[model samples]
Target: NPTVRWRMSTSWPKSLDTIYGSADELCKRVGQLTDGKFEIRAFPGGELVPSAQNMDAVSNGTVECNHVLSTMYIGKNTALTFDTGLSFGLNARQHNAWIHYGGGLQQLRELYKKYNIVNHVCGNVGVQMGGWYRKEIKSTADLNGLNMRIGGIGGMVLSKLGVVPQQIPPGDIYPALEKGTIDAAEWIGPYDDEKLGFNKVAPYYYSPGWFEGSASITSMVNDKAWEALPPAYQAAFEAACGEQSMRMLANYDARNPLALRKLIAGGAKVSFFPKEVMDAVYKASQQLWTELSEKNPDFKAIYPGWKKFQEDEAGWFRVAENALDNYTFAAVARAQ
Candidate 1:
């Protein structure tokens, strides 16, 4: 049997241990599961192609697959943003529900077919921290001219609030914040944020990354490559990917609490986004959806069902999951 070797490119840097760790583990596990019959080599973003070019690289067959966010290519199709999550979008459970059963994945595949890429919902960072700010954002007025590293619809939504949203790649954010080139930045919550040392430079940490209640990361493969795999190998690879995907989110959940505690102890001033800020962004986000639906056929196809999915899941989660978590968190602190 011929050894099957494939290449993968990622949009994360080598230094981002957890996010990149997922890609590394995926490669390692695929090799082991296939008994070395199938092998994959992973390259950090910029090693083969820059972060922004990942989708194009995969689409063009420059690489076999890429670990990336569909929203990163929103310029290609504004509807792509929903796959990640809109500002004020679904939470983790809700997001998973939307993707798996809400026809979200199907819409994603439809969009990808045009690019000759196959997409998979491979990972998620549950509700994220709002951002790291050099100054407190007490109201909507405070956001004007705020220089921040935000991406996708969230970035655009913030722009509507008069913020100067810069789409910086993860690796460059710390330095940008450190040098005062940017006033703020947002990455995944505590687990990844602590590693970047955001607390040291920007003491103000805010919550409710309203833009991304749950940011789903995806992996894309060349359509031809995906179709060419043997049935058994395909099943094994997909199963392994699903397992790895679940592990990624679980790792973040397990790690974020400790990291948050450490950051607070280290003098990071954590706060929540003001109701005013949230409200403004929420309104803008809805308007964004309407605009995209009218102009982008892909988004039009996905938004109605995705929106309904979010609404249905939100009702259930609020009644059960939210109630349990709300009381549980309060009780834990009271006990402490």
Candidate 2:
């Protein structure tokens, strides 16, 4: 029996358990499904390549696959941002629907074809906190000239408000924030943020990270390597990735509540984005999408389908999900 061995480079450090751990699980599941005929070795960030360059390694076949935050490569293609998120876009459930059912995966495959890669929805950290800020934001003006670690179209929207967005690797954020190299940084929410110890340096923890309403992680496979797989192996790889997506989201949902409480007890000041700031940024996000659609042909190609799905999803959620959540959450608060 011949064995197919491959390497999966990841953009997450091992300490960020759920994000990196999901990649490890994906490899394990793939191995089991293939009955030991296929094995994927997972490498945490910096082990194989710098976090931001995982996609490049996959595209160049330096590695056969990678687990990455797709938006990290927005510099290569604005449309890539949709693979992770857009400013104030879909929540985890809606995002999964778009990807698995609403044609998002198909659209993404077409986009990745240009890069000589194949994309799979592997994991997602639901809605993220806005960021860890050293200074409290009172108004939109407070964001002006604020150096922050952000990425993708969300960062682009922030630039409209005079934010200086810096894309620093996750491992470097704490040092940058502590030393005043950057004023604020946003990572996946509490469970991982606590591990990064961001609250230790930044006192004000803000909510509603509008840039990434839900951060979707992807498994990018080198096109040639993907093509070389047997049909059953290809299916096994996708099934394993899908399982990782579900488990990672559940892991975050279960862990974030306790981590948030721990962070608050440790003196982290939790706050929401001021109404004015949210309104302004929301407007900016909408404007950016419109402008991009008109100018970027690739963006334009996908905008109609994405926008329609978003609109319909919002409408349904507003009536059903929103109704239940608004009341249930308020009731829980009152009981507390």
Candidate 3:
């Protein structure tokens, strides 16, 4: 057999651990599991394909594959953002279940087919920190003309709420925030945030990254490349992606608490979205969903089912997981 070698690109800089680390681990694990029968060489974002152009690179076969968040390419198709998460979408664990078991991945694969790329769910960021802000936003008015690093429909929804959302790459965000080019910026959550050093420049850290409640990252391969793979290699690739996807979330779950503690100790002020802001964003999110459903058939095809799945899962979580988590979290705090 020809030494099955592939080239991969990443959408994250070499600096952010979660994003780049996921790519590195994917390449390493695939090589080890196949005993070098299958080999993948990974390039940090901008090294192989420019950070923002990863999807194009893969779609046009510039590289055999690339790791990127679906939301990054909303300009090509608004519906693609749903594959990442809409505002108030599923949480980390819920997202994994939805993609792997609830048919969301199949729907997403159909969506990607139009781009001449085959996408595998390579990783997830779980629920994310909302963003870093320069000032306390007591009301929606505070969002007026506030430049923020937000992307996808989240940016569009924020625009409805009077925010000026800027879509900048990860490598550029910290400097933008530092130089006052942007008033606020969002990356992933605590573990990645600590590495990015967002705490030093931005004091206010907010949650639930309403837009990215469940951010799924993708590995895209050329359509021909994917079809040409041997059945065993394909299964190995899929298994590797599934393992990395779950591992990424587990790492975030395990690492975020400590990262959060370190950030707070270093002067990062953390808070939840104000009720008013949350309400406005929520309303805008729904409006965006309705409008997209009317205009985009791909979104319409998947959304109704996706919504039902999400609601059902949430109901299940409330019945069992919620109470336990609430009690355990409070008990730990009380003891502390």
Candidate 4:
């Protein structure tokens, strides 16, 4: 059989292990499943095209596919945010359940079709840290005039709070923070953030990335390229993506605690967003959602379904998951 060789561009660099590793693993698995009939060569950010340009590269057929954080394209359409995560929306588990079984993926794919691409959930970094701040955020007033490197729906929510959102790429964030060009920045979690060395510039590290409860990574394939694939090859590719998604999340879970401890020992001051700040952001997120639903037809179309799923999932989690964790964690802390 003639081998089909393809190239994949990613929004992350190779240094961020779990994030870029997921794309590498997907390429490996697809090759294995197809017995070398399909080989995807993965390139990290800036290799095939700039990280921010990955989706466009795939859509325009400059590349066959790209593994990226879909939310990066929210400027193109606010509806794209749901494909990644909503501000204070579903956690990783619920997100997986919705996209895999609750009809979210179908809706997402339909949306991608408009851009001449196909979407696949390839990876996730669960429950990211809020961000590294130059100073503690005591209240909503602290956000005014703060220059933060953030993106997607979260950026929009912050903008409402008078934040100057800078859409800088991951590689550029540390320097921006160091040079005082941006006051704060949020990357995946401890592991990647440590690698980026954000702690050196911004000592205050916060938890609970409200904008993205669970950040999803997706593989966007050019529509023409996808249709040219044999049915068996397509099936193998999809299965490989599913495997990588689980693998990436597990890798982050195993590595983050160790990374957090090391960062704290090395001078990172870990904290939570103050109650006032959290409350303000929550209110802003709700208002933004409502405003978008009215102005963006695509957002409006998906809002009802996504909102229902999120609310129902939260109800179940509050009764069981939250209660169990609250008690278990408190007991563990007391014993320690």
State the lDDT of candidate 4 residue by residue for 173-286, as single tens digits: 888888888999987689988877788889999878898868888999999999999999999889998988899999999999999988888789999998889999999999
Clash pairs, model 2 backbone: none
Positional deviation of 305 in candidate 4, in angstroms? 0.9
- lDDT, candidate 4, equals 0.89
lDDT of 3 by residue, 107-176 (tens): 8888888898888988888778888988888878888888999876778888997888897866788888
Residue 267, candidate 1: Cα error in Å is: 1.3
Runs with alpha carbons beyond 4 Å of true place in candidate 2: 167-181
Model 3 weakest lDDT span, ten residues long: 11-20
Evaluated against the true structure, the overall lDDT of model 1 is 0.84
Model 3 residue 72 distance off true place after TM-score fit, in angstroms: 0.9
Candidates in descending lDDT order: 2, 4, 3, 1
Worst 10 residues of 4 by lDDT: 166-175
Q: What is the Cα-based TM-score of model 3?
A: 0.93
Find the number of clashing residue pairs for candidate 2. 0
Per-model TM values vs. the true structure: 0.94, 0.93, 0.93, 0.93
How do the residues 130-155 of candidate 2 rate in per-residue lDDT, one tens digit apiece?
98999999999999999999867778
lDDT for position 84 in model 3: 80
